Write a protein that binds this ligand. Structure first.
Ligand SMILES: Nc1ccn([C@H]2C[C@H](O)[C@@H](COP(=O)(O)OP(=O)(O)OP(=O)(O)O)O2)c(=O)n1
Ligand SMILES: [Ca+2]
Ligand SMILES: [Ca+2]
Ligand SMILES: [Ca+2]
Length: 903
DNA sequence: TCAGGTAAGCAGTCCGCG
DNA sequence: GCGGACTGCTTAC
């Protein structure tokens, strides 16, 4: 097999590399790698190395890496550019793996672990590590085993051995319900003392050294705690055995309002799953506790126990250990679904970077571009210092707040990367500038043609057309990969809808789910078999289709993220190819493209309807347009349609056969106007929206920019079994909005769009009547909480104190003195409730850590003093009044002359 | 919230507005 | 009471 790296490090003048050799074996080597850097040289000097601008360079080979770094410094002192890859391990990988890396994941040791630490005096700080580690569960992907290290004797209590028999039993048998599928995979090791536990853990670690190290909060808690605890007990040298090269470094991670410490383990790639989740999941969660996320992702029950976690080991060690094991499994289950590890490996090996560098698109793209240029013997420029500067972005059209009955939307495929490719935007393709006219002049095609030679953007930039830049070349490769995975995603989505339809008529039979590949549209044979299946088999197939869709989503959306982040990197001061001329070229072209096509669509539809100056495009944001289809529907007549699906088909056909060709023609003209390299503005129909045929539903509404709701029947070629609400920006979509309120507001919207005013009025009346019965957590608001200290003046709100921070200070006074009470963590999230006047907390609101029950110290008082009236007005009534005013509807029935008769 | 970008909405504070 | 200036936080893209 072809060799591939696992980890790479620079330690002084040596590269330390762990790798899989040609025989499939894990090896480690130390290489005295001699790096090369570059200086510009005279034209008369014969060379094969040239910078990206075509200027000749001489290669300087250094005796070692320290010499190379010192040379860079001296070049700065002289005031001359030091060219080449300054990150020497990236150069090492480029030299050592000069081919497309094909990795075998089965050879890569992926470890995920979780530790338990009993602490009687609050949160056990990892920098201190003053409390015993009393449990470690460490899953190894190669062994497929959960290694459980269990401390039986502690200063906080001596306990009996954990029982695998009880662990396996149902909660109703007094067991822990450790999933049956992992029971036989548990290797249980009890220890009579913490020293022997940790020494064995280290010996185990040496034998089975993680390449990828993951878990939940492992980088912020588990790793630093383990390292510091071992350091405290045994000394530094023993703790450093967590590194296969015995090198570690305390790394200070800085943010806007403070800093924290992590431990860098040389020769390991830490991919903390919480951070993978935050980057790649495209959620914003009210809480990032493993419990909360596992419930959200897997629909698994909350892990229940009596009393505080500080007393769990002493009171129920059985449950304590089982829950430690389950926590490790839940991360594996989340990854089985989301597949962020697979994604990270894919990206890392493609770029030829340390796998952990996938968190940095700047590092990822620097490596991709370097490898690409190196292939042509080209030499990368030196990174430079730049001051942070604001620059303009997208255009968003101001909509007229209103109901909109029939809507067709259109969207440009991968806009910013498509602009990069079309215009040929790259550091080395800059041709010069032209004299800019107001943007409106380009939008209306009245400005003079920018260039007859170069490819242009309306920000004044011109680009070479003779050959693709490295940025267009490399962005295209990843775009093409994204397209493939999106194809799989949409097929699985369409397949899911086929199964949902079949579930209306399930067969009374006992059978199996079909063995199919959900990434491809079901054949006629498969569809016929599906119509004969039981509900049990169909539901299993639906679950599998949805899992395939999720797998495709991860793969496609994050390749989309990577390519959009290349645009983003052009506007980031730390990128080697940072250039606001290029960043603004992209965004300004986008603004023109959107408003150009708005004009073209308006012109086309005014022509086909026989009107003048009427606005068919009701809204647009960045790269999308929303087109009113009322007049199209009205031209055929609503009475001519058999059912909802009939007018959906009609609009589908109209968009594809009439509108899309018109849009294409408009963009081809724009391409010629800007003299671009390649026409790549592909705007396809996205959503078809409207009320159910014969209903009093309003179909859709806009309240303002980035705030709308649509009843969608077809999305990107997926015809839904049931209409799906597309709600953007509204309170239903905000993590700050209470859970039960999101639900209620969503039902209000559903009724507005599908059923009408009277239906909405009936639901509002009921929610207002019953909402005080809702669980307090479900009606609590949520907010991130920063700068708590800034607004804390003697435990009381300082000037301009934010409402949620006021809540935290109220909480802090109420739990004052309690060492065991849950602390609000700076930078994390809190639940927030309003309090009625005259309450014992002495203020108008209280806040507590999100994803948790408020401490029993104050729970009863919070419940008693919760201001339901304020809660309802702020979170529910005010947003609903916004929706209904925009939609021109009333959520409460107005008095009429009919009131009253009957006698 | 260490780790690509901008536009833009709403909650809330402060306080003017005769 | 509502809006403007401002901070904070959250979305859409
Ligand atoms: N996280 C994001 C999302 C969007 N944008 C920019 C780049 C996108 O090209 C443009 C439009 O965003 P879309 O959500 O419509 O995504 P794309 O057009 O890139 O991809 P596609 O529509 O094919 O899914 O906005 C961005 O810079 N970063
Ligand atoms: Ca798009
Ligand atoms: Ca059937
Ligand atoms: Ca879009």
């Amino acid at each position: 097999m072809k060799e591939f790296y696992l980890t790479v490090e620079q330690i002084g003048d040596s590269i330390f590399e762990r790798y899989i050799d040609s025989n499939g074996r894990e090896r480690t080597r130390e290489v005295e790698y001699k790096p090369s850097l570059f200086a510009h040289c005279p034209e008369s000097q014969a060379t094969k190395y040239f910078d990206i601008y075509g200027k000749p360079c001489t290669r300087k080979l250094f005796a070692n890496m320290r010499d190379a770094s010192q040379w860079i410094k001296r070049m700065e002192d002289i005031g001359l550019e030091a060219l080449g890859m300054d990150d020497f391990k990236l150069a090492y990988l480029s030299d050592t793996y000069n081919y497309e890396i094909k990795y075998d994941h089965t050879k890569i040791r992926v470890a995920n672990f979780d530790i338990e630490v009993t602490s009687p005096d609050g949160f056990p700080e990892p920098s201190q590590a003053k409390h015993p580690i009393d449990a470690i569960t460490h899953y190894d992907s190669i062994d497929d085993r959960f290694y459980v290290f269990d401390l039986l004797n502690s200063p906080y209590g001596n306990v009996e051995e954990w029982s695998i028999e009880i662990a396996a039993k149902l909660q109703e048998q007094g067991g822990d319900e450790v999933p049956s599928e992992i029971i036989d995979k548990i290797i249980y090791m009890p220890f009579d003392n913490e020293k022997e536990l940790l020494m064995e853990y280290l010996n185990f670690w040496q034998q089975k050294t993680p390449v990828i190290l993951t878990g939940w909060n492992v980088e912020s808690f588990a790793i630093p705690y383990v390292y510091n605890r071992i350091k405290n007990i045994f000394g530094e040298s023993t703790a450093k055995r967590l590194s296969p090269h015995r090198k570690t470094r305390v790394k200070v991670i800085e943010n806007m309002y403070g800093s924290r410490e992590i431990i860098t383990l040389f020769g390991i790639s830490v991919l903390d799953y919480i951070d993978l989740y935050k980057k790649f999941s495209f959620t914003n969660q009210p809480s990032y506790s493993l419990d909360y996320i596992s419930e959200f992702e897997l629909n698994v029950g909350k892990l229940k126990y009596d009393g505080p976690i500080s007393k769990l080991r002493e009171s129920n060690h059985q449950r304590y250990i089982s829950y430690n094991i389950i926590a490790v499994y839940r991360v594996l289950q989340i990854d089985a679904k989301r597949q962020f590890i697979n994604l990270s490996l894919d990206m890392g090996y493609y770029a030829k970077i340390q796998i952990q560098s996938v968190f940095s698109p700047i590092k990822t793209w620097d490596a991709i571009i370097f490898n690409s240029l190196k292939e042509q013997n080209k030499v990368i420029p030196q990174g430079r210092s730049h001051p942070v500067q604001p620059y303009p972005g997208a255009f968003v059209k101001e909509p007229i707040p209103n109901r909109y009955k029939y809507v067709m939307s259109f969207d440009l495929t991968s806009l910013y990367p498509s602009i990069i490719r079309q215009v040929n935007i790259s550091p080395e393709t800059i041709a010069g500038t032209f004299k800019v006219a107001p943007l409106h002049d380009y939008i209306n095609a009245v400005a003079e043609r920018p260039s007859d030679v170069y490819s242009c953007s309306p920000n004044g930039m011109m680009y070479y057309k003779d050959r693709d830049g490295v940025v267009p070349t490399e962005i295209t490769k990843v775009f093409n990969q994204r397209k493939e995975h999106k194809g799989y995603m949409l097929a699985a989505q369409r397949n899911g809808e086929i199964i949902k339809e079949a579930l209306h008529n399930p067969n009374l039979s006992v059978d199996e789910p079909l063995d199919v590949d959900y990434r491809f549209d079901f054949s006629d044979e498969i569809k016929e078999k599906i119509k004969k299946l039981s509900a049990k088999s169909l539901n299993e197939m639906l679950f599998r289709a949805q899992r395939t869709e999720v797998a495709g989503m991860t793969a496609q959306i994050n390749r989309k993220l990577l390519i959009n982040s290349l645009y983003g990197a052009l506007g980031n001061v730390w990128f080697r190819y940072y250039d606001l001329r290029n960043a603004t070229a992209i965004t300004t072209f986008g603004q023109m493209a959107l408003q150009w096509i708005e004009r073209k669509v308006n012109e086309y539809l005014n022509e086909v309807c026989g009107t003048e100056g009427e606005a068919f495009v009701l809204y647009g944001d960045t790269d999308s347009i929303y087109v009113s289809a009322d007049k199209i529907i009205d031209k055929v007549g609503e009475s001519k349609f058999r059912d909802t699906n009939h007018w959906v088909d009609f609009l589908d056909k109209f968009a594809r056969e009439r509108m899309e060709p018109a849009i294409d023609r408009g963009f081809r003209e724009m391409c010629e106007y800007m003299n671009n390299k390649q026409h790549l503005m592909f705007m396809d129909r996205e959503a078809i929206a409207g009320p159910p045929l014969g209903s009093k539903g309003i179909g859709g509404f806009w309240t303002g920019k980035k705030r709308y709701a649509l009843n969608v029947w077809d999305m990107e070629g997926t015809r839904y079994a049931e209409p799906k609400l597309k709600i953007m920006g509204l309170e239903t979509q905000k993590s700050s909005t209470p859970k039960a309120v999101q639900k209620a507001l969503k039902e209000c919207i559903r009724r507005m769009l599908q059923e009408g005013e009277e239906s909405l009025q009936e639901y509002f009346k009921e929610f207002e009547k019953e909402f005080r019965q809702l669980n307090y957590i479900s009606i609590a608001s949520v907010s991130s909480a920063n700068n708590i200290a800034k607004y804390d003046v003697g435990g009381f709100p300082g000037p301009k104190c934010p409402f949620h921070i006021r809540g935290i200070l109220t909480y802090n006074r109420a739990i004052k003195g309690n060492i065991d009470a849950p602390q609000v963590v700076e930078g994390e999230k809190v639940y927030v409730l309003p309090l009625r006047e005259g309450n014992p907390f002495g203020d108008k609101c209280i806040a507590w850590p999100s994803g948790t029950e408020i401490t029993d110290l104050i729970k009863d008082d919070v419940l008693h003093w919760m201001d339901y009236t304020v809660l309802l007005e702020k979170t529910f009534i005010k947003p609903l009044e916004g929706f209904t005013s925009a939609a021109k509807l009333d959520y409460e029935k107005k008095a009429s002359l009919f009131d009253m008769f009957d006698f």
